[PDB]
Amino acid sequence: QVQLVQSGGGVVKTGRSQRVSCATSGFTFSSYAIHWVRQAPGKGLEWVAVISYDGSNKYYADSVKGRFTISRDSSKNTVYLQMNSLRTEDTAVYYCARSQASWQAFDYWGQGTLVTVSSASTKGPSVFPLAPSSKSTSGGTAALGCLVKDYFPEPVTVSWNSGALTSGVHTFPAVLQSSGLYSLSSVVTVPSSSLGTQTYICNVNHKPSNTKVDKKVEPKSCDK
Amino acid sequence: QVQLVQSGGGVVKTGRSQRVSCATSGFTFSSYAIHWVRQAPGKGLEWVAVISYDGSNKYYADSVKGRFTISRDSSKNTVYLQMNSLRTEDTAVYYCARSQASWQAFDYWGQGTLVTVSSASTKGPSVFPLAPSSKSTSGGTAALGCLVKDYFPEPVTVSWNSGALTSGVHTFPAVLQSSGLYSLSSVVTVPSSSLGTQTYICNVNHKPSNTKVDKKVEPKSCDK
Amino acid sequence: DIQMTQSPSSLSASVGDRVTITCRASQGVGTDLAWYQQKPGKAPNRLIFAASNLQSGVPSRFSGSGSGTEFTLTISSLQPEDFATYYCLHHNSFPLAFGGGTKVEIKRTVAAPSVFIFPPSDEQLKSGTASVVCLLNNFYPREAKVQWKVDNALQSGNSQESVTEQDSKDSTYSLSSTLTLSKADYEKHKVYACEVTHQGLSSPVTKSFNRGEC
Amino acid sequence: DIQMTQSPSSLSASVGDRVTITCRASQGVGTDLAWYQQKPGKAPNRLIFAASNLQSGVPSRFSGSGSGTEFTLTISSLQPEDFATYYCLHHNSFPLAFGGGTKVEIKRTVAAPSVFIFPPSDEQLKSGTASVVCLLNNFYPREAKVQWKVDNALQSGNSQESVTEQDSKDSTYSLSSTLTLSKADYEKHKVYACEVTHQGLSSPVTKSFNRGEC
Amino acid sequence: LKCKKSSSYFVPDARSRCTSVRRCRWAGDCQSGCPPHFTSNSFSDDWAGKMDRAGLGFSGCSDGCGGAACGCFNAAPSCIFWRKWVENPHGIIWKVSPCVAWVPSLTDLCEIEELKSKKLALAPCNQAGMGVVGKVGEIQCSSEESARTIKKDGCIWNADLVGIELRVDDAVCYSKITSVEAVANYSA
Amino acid sequence: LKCKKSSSYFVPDARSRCTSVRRCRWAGDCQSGCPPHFTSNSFSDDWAGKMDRAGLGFSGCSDGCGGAACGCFNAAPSCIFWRKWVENPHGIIWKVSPCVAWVPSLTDLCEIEELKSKKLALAPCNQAGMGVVGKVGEIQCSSEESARTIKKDGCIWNADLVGIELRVDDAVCYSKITSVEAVANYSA
Questions:
Q1: Is D56 in Cβ contact with F166 (below 8 Å)?
Q2: Could you tell me if C92 and C130 lie in one domain?
Q3: Which chain F residues are Cβ-neighbours of D49 within 8 angstroms?
Q4: For D184, which of A125, B193, D48, F58 is 20 to 30 Å away at the CA?
Q5: Range A3-117: architecture per CATH
């Protein structure tokens, strides 16, 4: 069966270089063109470039033309996308896909190689509590969480009580603050009556900085 | 046996107040004077104050006279030291000890109840790595650690690999930086050959901010 | 340059339904057009090529048609997996181009959010910045208006929002709004409120706290 | 005001030894003087009162003596537990006052420190401050001078030191010095060294790292 | 005004075809996919074999459906080999001659003489030796014999003028070839 | 100059004694420490009872060692009952008169008349009714008869003028009593 295996993602400074690559089996490499399609986080698909069956024809989207290179190596069954003078917006999952003529639709996709382009630099997550009170008592069911602020780069995974509090949790997708650091949240609703008997601890994973963080969210007195 | 049980410690903002107390058994409480002595962190003993057999005479050192009060509650067998206009230097473990006359030597002591007086506020520990390399290879034995920097208030308890790395550890006393936050260190010796086959994780537990932090210490490339 | 516009940008529909997404181009693109199914954070799949050809192996309930500037993808009977984002691509000329996409979400009954507000933690204030958090919890449909008022003065620009995906058990979303302010601006005021506008609420709901009491 | 000086400020002695600590006052304190044994972070204990009375329950190998301004605490035969800090107190007048203290530790053969140097991490650098740490490890005696050199320029004032108590198993110490600088001052320079001067080392040991190769 | 003619080439009447055959894994072509010794100039003895083995055209292979549902026992993902090519069924040929300068008796115009009908025409065309998609001379032959059957030898092209799209049991050719006759009766 | 005498008191010639008896846990009184009904004016029938139960002085009790080497069967936490007191063994008394103002014919002067010898002296002294430690009249009796045997009835004092410290089988009196005699031979 037909397959295309990317590799080479990572973090990269705004302005620097990166090489994503796409190595294919299943078919006859030098009969098909290859395209790159990229997807910013939670955005649409965007077409990046394509190289013809023999490398003679290369065409580029208008947003990277003049900055990206596609190329191909008959012997390794591989296609390379070179990315120079990278900018922050270029951050995306880069999928490579097969196409027989260079102008036809793509059929088989790659799994994507993620590229994150930021002037930021690795930082650990500050985990804060979001403490319940009678300002979150909604029918004798209260809501409490962790605010995981000012880290880089994604992902951090937040879980509750080391596995035993799952139902009723929502961990929200990161935002990116003007700084270049991520601000995600994570919350659970439990019953008000357990708010005095039950301990609640979130477990944050930032393996991009080998950090691990446990936080106990305890009630606060907001009816003074 | 004669026994004396203090209580009432804690942290307090510079300028505010605190009350520690001493409750006695074994003897005839209101036949004995009671003394208070404090021990600043890693310092000598300093003599603080005293209340005579009946409260009628109280004497205070030159540094707390005008700021501390001693008093006593015959029915509860208690002596109280109230400490007002607290300052940073007053940070100490506070001991109470018996004396028959108001001027004799102390005989039986209390366990000490700790007072921390600071203009600071609760903070989590930033945990940074101390990575082994060819810059700490001393006879085929290398040293790796954690820097637990910029926290308040003590203690942080440090363990390694959640405990199965004990032999050869040195956990240092916290220092207190111009900032006002503690910079303790912690290190372990390992044999070099295990630096790639063995994982090393330090576990910093700071329950004063309900924080826990695991840090993975791995080698870095310094020979380029 | 050619521009592919999809509509509806997203629709909500249910199992057994018929679903029709329209892709529309700003120039002729003949029959050089294709349709893709993308389930979340996965590789898209080709559904349709030549604007009418069923990608080999895609179910017969899928069908494409059109030419020129109009194309219509049609699932006769939405089956539970057919929920995804759906994309059109025109390959009539270089550069190629995709459409915006149409997300096909689950339609369920109208449900109002629980709203909770969390003032900035003390450990966070102390370092120099305050993150006030508003939570709208377990609501449908995904659309909701969250405005922050500081002493009945509307704020503008200082918010970020974020929404969870349609939950696996009730088909309801949850929005979290993080209001980041300087510690000096946070302490300058007493009553902080997030005000929620939703289809499931007859008039907007306010959740507030008074800073000194916390 | 009376001023109590002990000496030696600290001594090293071994089992079976004879030990003599002297407390000295700046005025008469008669015989109103008392001697306390404090192991680290534990309850102080009273050994001697009236300058010469053995506290009820204290071993006979202890004895106090003196009067006026000089007092002598005396162990005839140091036993393993007697390692501790020892303090005098004069209660001749109010305010009472303690002496400086005498630490009596274990004496062992001379041993050289392992010396290691740790540069600041990226996760720390990038946020704005660099703490270089020098570690001196498993050595005796406790006395050691840690001088920081930045590009062959000796540093002064930006360090802290921190020493473990005499380890329970070999009688060896370990010092760590934390050198805090701004990231901007750290990045301005190439060759960083900590220089350890200790008796067990024939020449001062310098351990360095060069900023760029890491 | 007259055309100052540089050299000239031949264009065929190219009607684009394609074919594909699916062989099983158990076959002798197929091992863990497609032979690397199959290339854009290999042929299969199995194809709808009328094929002019000396002609301009392109080949390739891919794995297809393999299973107990696609013609080959044991559930083996099977090989599909395909050729997309151009052919000149009616022997039609046009001589194209670029005009280097127009001379009394606009840029990038060319005289296009039909060879049977000798009917003349004017249209834009590629310069000799450039299989540029879009203009007359996508396919350029160096000799009337080469254009008569689009010999692989005398004739050039891009092979992306022709697309193929595989299906289960046949495939679907596409042609992006600009037709001479569709540029040379409007300006004839 | 002459002395202006206000309300005047008597000072006894105080010698400080003290005593202790150790009863083990079982001598009735003794329990998980000392009985709470023993106070700073309690007496024991055991302390060598020549001592005046109508006299000025302070008492108390403590746990001692419990052990098979500590006087008590079973290693029992033992009671030590102790009384520290003052006494006037040679019956001497001084008439002390604070001088409110020096008057013609150095604050805090007082006449100290001895009562047998009629020996006079001038010295610092407490104002009447103040057992201020350090000064003549730390112990003040309000009557020549009370100064004669220092009754708790006629006399005041701070009881911290006498310190006691217990050992295994006795205790050691310490005395901070300023001797009248030692200020009234120097300033006689």
A1: yes
A2: no
A3: 165
A4: A125
A5: Sandwich (2.60)
| Identity of residue B35 | H
- Tell me the H-state helices in C109-178: 122-125
Chain C: give the shortest CA distance to residue B180, in Å: 13
Cβ burial of C181 (10 Å; 0-12, 13-18, 19+) is buried
Q: Kindly report the number of other CB atoms within 10 A of residue A129's CB atom.
A: 25
Fold of the domain spanning B3-118: Immunoglobulin-like (2.60.40)
- Strands C85-90 and C97-98, sheet pairing: antiparallel
Structural domain including F78 reads: 18-87
Please check whether residue E108 touches A, CB under 8 A. no
Smallest CA–CA distance from C87 into chain A, residue:
A45
Burial class (CB in 10 A: 0-12, 13-18, 19+), F1: exposed
CA distance F127 to F140: 10
Decide the pairing of beta strands D159-163 and C159-163: unpaired
CATH no. for residue D98? 2.60.40.10
Of D49, D124, D176, nearest to B185 by CB-CB distance is: D176
Calpha distance B23→F34 (Å, rounded): 15
D113 preceded by a cis bond (ω within 30 of 0): no
Q: Are A169 and A161 in contact (CB under 8 A)?
A: no
Instruction: Indicate if the alpha-carbon torsion angle A61, A62, A64, A69 is positive or negative.
Output: positive
Q: What residues of chain A lie within 8 A of the CB of B211, using their CB?
A: 127, 213-215
Q: What is the CA radius of gyration of chain D?
A: 22
Do F59 and F99 lie in a common domain?
no
Residue of F nearest to D56 (CA): F167
Could you tell me if D29 lies within 8 Å of chain F, comparing CB atoms?
no
Same domain as C89, residue C120: no
Strand, coil or helix: E149: helix
Backbone angle region of F42, left / alpha / beta, with phi > 0 → left and psi within -120 to 50 → alpha: beta
Q: How many domains does chain F have?
A: 2
Shortest Cα distance from D73 to chain A (angstroms)?
51
Question: How far is Cα B174 from Cα B184, in angstroms, rounded to an integer?
Answer: 4
How close C160 gets to chain B, by Cα (Å)? 25
Rounded to 10 degrees, the C-alpha dihedral E126/E130/E132/E135 comes to 20
Residue A5: closest CA among chain C residues belongs to which residue? C43
Q: Are residues E76 and E94 in the same domain?
A: no
Q: Are residues E102 and E33 in the same domain?
A: no
- Judge whether C101 and C132 are in contact, CB under 8 Å: no
- Domain of residue D126 covers 114-213
Contact D18, F128 (CB under 8 A): no
Put simply, the answer to whether C176 touches A129 (Cβ < 8 Å) is no
For residue D176, the chain B residues in CB contact (below 8 A) are 170, 172, 185, 187
Residue B43 has which token pair? Answer: 């310092």
CA pair distance B60, A38, nearest whole angstrom? 76
The domain total for chain C is: 2
Contact B130 D137 (CB under 8 A): no
Q: In angstroms, what is the resolution? A: 3.3
Q: Residue E69: CB partners within 8 Å, gap ≥ 6?
A: none
A to E CB pairs, distance under 8 Å: 59
> Is chain B in touch with chain F: ≥3 Cβ pairs within 8 A?
yes
